[PDB]
Amino acid sequence: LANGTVMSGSHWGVFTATVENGRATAFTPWEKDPHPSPMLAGVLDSIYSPTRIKYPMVRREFLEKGVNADRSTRGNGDFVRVSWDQALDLVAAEVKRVEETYGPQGVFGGSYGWKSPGRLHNCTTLLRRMLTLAGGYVNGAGDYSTGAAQVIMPHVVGTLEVYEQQTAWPVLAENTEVMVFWAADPIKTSQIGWVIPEHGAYPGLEALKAKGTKVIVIDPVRTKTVEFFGAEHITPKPQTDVAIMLGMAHTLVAEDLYDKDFIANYTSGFDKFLPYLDGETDSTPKTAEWAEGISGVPAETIKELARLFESKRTMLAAGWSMQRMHHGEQAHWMLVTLASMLGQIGLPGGGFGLSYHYSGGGTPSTSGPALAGITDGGAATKGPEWLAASGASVIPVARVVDMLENPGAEFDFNGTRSKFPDVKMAYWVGGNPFVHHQDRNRMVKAWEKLETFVVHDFQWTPTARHADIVLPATTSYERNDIETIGDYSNTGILAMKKIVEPLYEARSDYDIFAAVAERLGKGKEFTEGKDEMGWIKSFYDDAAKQGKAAGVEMPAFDAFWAEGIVEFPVTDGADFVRYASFREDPLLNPLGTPTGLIEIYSKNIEKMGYDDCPAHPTWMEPLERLDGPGAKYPLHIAASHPFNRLHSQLNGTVLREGYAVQGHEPCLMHPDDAAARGIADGDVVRVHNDRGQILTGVKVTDAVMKGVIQIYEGGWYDPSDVTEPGTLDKYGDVNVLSADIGTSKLAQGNCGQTVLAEVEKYTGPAVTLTGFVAPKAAE
Ligand SMILES: NC1=NC(=O)C2=N[C@H]3C(S)=C(S)[C@@H](COP(=O)(O)OP(=O)(O)OC[C@H]4O[C@@H](n5cnc6c(=O)[nH]c(N)nc65)[C@H](O)[C@@H]4O)O[C@H]3NC2=N1
Ligand SMILES: NC1=NC(=O)C2=N[C@H]3C(S)=C(S)[C@@H](COP(=O)(O)OP(=O)(O)OC[C@H]4O[C@@H](n5cnc6c(=O)[nH]c(N)nc65)[C@H](O)[C@@H]4O)O[C@H]3NC2=N1
């Protein structure tokens, strides 16, 4: 049995594993990581925990009755263990049956999810590679993170903006005087990366503090970002940020402070927005006092902030929770409108940035080459012959339950109309929709429309528990791969070396899909005649050739593999100022909008005629909001990202012991809200509204503002009885309480943070948690 050390990486960073007798026993952070995540110990434990999936399983009802199975019992744990050969034969026959019977519109292959990094073992791209060979599939578009912002930005500034490099951290340290974290908690959300993280935000944040820059945080919760800086903390009622921004803009106009020259030369449509702001159009001037009545933030604080931003070099760093809500498109559109009025866009240290809290945005980029990986093949095909009727081949990701309930119905998206396809099977890998999607009770019933549901994962999540066919995948630590370090920085390239042998009967997603492609008669087309190391070497060799051209020297493949990593040099990346060339000469360097300027009023959006997405930033009432007129429930739930998980990942590990309260997901509650209900620290409470009910464990703190409770997304849904409609969730999946609606007709984004509920001390019968041990038949 092996003894020794091996270096690899993950969504949480680079590390060295210690192996003793063939088992990994410690993960130690990379010596060059400036700020390792405390979640690394849970990553190691996820390889071996009680919920690791050991064998291929088929739901007993599905095995016995196929398409005639009773579909309401999915999730009760009644599984049968089968051999790999039987399982692969069944999956392959079901994929082919559905493709022949219903066409490519019958298979949903969107499979949204965070999976693991790795250019070769990219389970979702491998899924689409196989489905392409099978005849086609319906895909998803956009994502759950910036579903609204990524669609409105191209109409305002011309590009996506949210996933683009920010003005560099060192430029901010030398030039910014006031830094604003608006609906952003960079300390919390910078621990992970899509590719391997370099944790570049931490040194950037430390340099701002050492310089004594004034930091302001606008967030209903007193986060570690607030605590690290001793920041001035503004706490708006959730979903009222647009009203605050309008009251700031109104103040800048009334006191005649705003930058008229910036507005005149770099923007379009401000004259059509002004009348709205002043109340000429609706008899309601959007003053600081009007904003105070909606948001609860004192009118004079709103005014002082507006003056301060106008007089100092200010960076408006905004996060994404405020656009993960009804009418989310207005939040960042109004933010950019406010930034335009301040006139600092394109100056070193000023303007705005939408990715300082995500994957190291602002960390200086190197001059290295880009690494490429396996593809789904669609780019070199001639896929399905598609046409309306059968419906759209792509849907906005968060409309997956609407699609299932309304096959053939039309939906709007960014100015076009499309039809939902009639899906009969879904194949999910690397994602956990029975945790990540909204309105769980609705989704549970809608899922009965699917004949067949196949899932691959290495943990028994609620999604795998609901499958008809469950196949055990390996982790990244049981295979070899290659990946970039740094989504924006491109710090280097890492060899993700195998640490231990595959556990139990687990197989990589690549091997499972290759075996399904082989039964479809298309094995060589899937594999390309290459094995694991052959694929990895060809990605490396391609990057090395690109590197050569550009003057970046890289070692041959085997020398790179022996070292385990290659790092690239930073040339001018540390001086990058976003929008500087636009500011310097807007005629030579225009934005990619219809006018070539920042569009405060959009004629294009005006033509779409959407009632829920007007042609300029607008305050509109959401479905439900804290203290809204006629609101039924009293507390807003901040259903934000978990500090000690990556969404649902790591919930079934030893780290859960450090935050669970009586075994359940924690609920943070203000002392006065607790006292009014007779709730004490540590009590189990029932959190409920008209869509669902869950149990959580309370931690009483004044870190959350009064009227707000914090229950993070990601908890593993553990239903008392899958056949009972609206059954109680014993663990605390906050998406049992959210509503499943689009942000607007423009983007159709999810509204996972538009949530109100009531809380009461739980006094019902004691409950047994069953989500963190495998189903009995899977032991
Ligand atoms: N540790 C960690 N775990 C993760 O699961 C994780 N997920 C990653 C992903 S996939 C993404 S897309 C990014 C998401 O990054 P994003 O900015 O969406 O993160 P959230 O945790 O949803 O919200 C950030 C802050 O917004 C505050 N907030 C909520 N509602 C409001 C509001 O109405 N107004 C204001 N002003 N603030 C509000 C919350 O209290 C929270 O502190 O995080 C990434 N980083 C992650 N880190
Ligand atoms: N209410 C609410 N508020 C929110 O703020 C919120 N955030 C949204 C956001 S921004 C996103 S990005 C989504 C995230 O939702 P997402 O489904 O991406 O969440 P994860 O828990 O990372 O699911 C990843 C799954 O892939 C598995 N996996 C990892 N590697 C592999 C592999 O190699 N092979 C296979 N077969 N499986 C693998 C993991 O074990 C895990 O179960 O949540 C969204 N949901 C949200 N809801």
Curated annotation (Swiss-Prot):
Q: What does this protein need as cofactor?
A: Mo-bis(molybdopterin guanine dinucleotide)
**Keyword vocabulary terms for this entry:** Metal-binding, Molybdenum, Oxidoreductase, Periplasm, Signal
Q: Catalysed reaction per UniProt?
A: dimethyl sulfide + a menaquinone + H2O = dimethyl sulfoxide + a menaquinol; trimethylamine + 2 Fe(III)-[cytochrome c] + H2O = trimethylamine N-oxide + 2 Fe(II)-[cytochrome c] + 3 H(+)
From the UniProt record, give one GO term of the biological process aspect: anaerobic respiration
Gene3D superfamilies, alphabetically? 2.40.40.20, 3.40.50.740, Dimethylsulfoxide Reductase, domain 2 (3.40.228.10), Dimethylsulfoxide Reductase, domain 3 (3.90.55.10)
Source organism, top-level taxon: Bacteria
Report the GO terms under cellular component.
outer membrane-bounded periplasmic space
Describe its function. Catalyzes the reduction of dimethyl sulfoxide (DMSO) and trimethylamine N-oxide (TMAO) to dimethyl sulfide (DMS) and trimethylamine, respectively. The terminal DMSO reductase can also use various sulfoxides and N-oxide compounds as terminal electron acceptor in addition to DMSO and TMAO.
This one is known as Dimethyl sulfoxide/trimethylamine N-oxide reductase
User: What species was this sequence derived from?
Assistant: Rhodobacter capsulatus (Rhodopseudomonas capsulata)
